[PDB]
Design a protein around this nucleic acid. Structure first.
Length: 52
RNA sequence: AUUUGGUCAAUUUGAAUACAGAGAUCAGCAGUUCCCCUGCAUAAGGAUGAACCGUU
């Protein structure tokens, strides 16, 4: 249970996560260790693929 | 100088029959315990993956 809100798409936003403790821990791990947020990526659109 | 270490049992008896006394050998498999591997389940506990936006 929870959510992920954010401002203006590109802007800063909040994840809230709620549940059983193990699950929460797992989620945290995913957020921090597994995902690389600073990593570069590609946006796919009809006009052209935008490198970010 | 002599002699004991020498009684077959069993059965039929009121000595005769018996005659030494009645399964062997070879081979499987399973179980018992411990160990190792393998697949599955059960709990727990990780690790990780997967496009893209979601819900009043």
């Amino acid at each position: 249970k929870g959510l992920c809100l954010r401002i203006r798409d590109d802007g800063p936003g909040i994840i809230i996560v709620v549940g059983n403790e193990k699950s929460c821990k797992f989620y945290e791990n995913l957020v921090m260790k597994r995902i690389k947020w600073n990593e570069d990526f590609e946006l796919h659109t009809n006009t052209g693929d935008i490198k970010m």
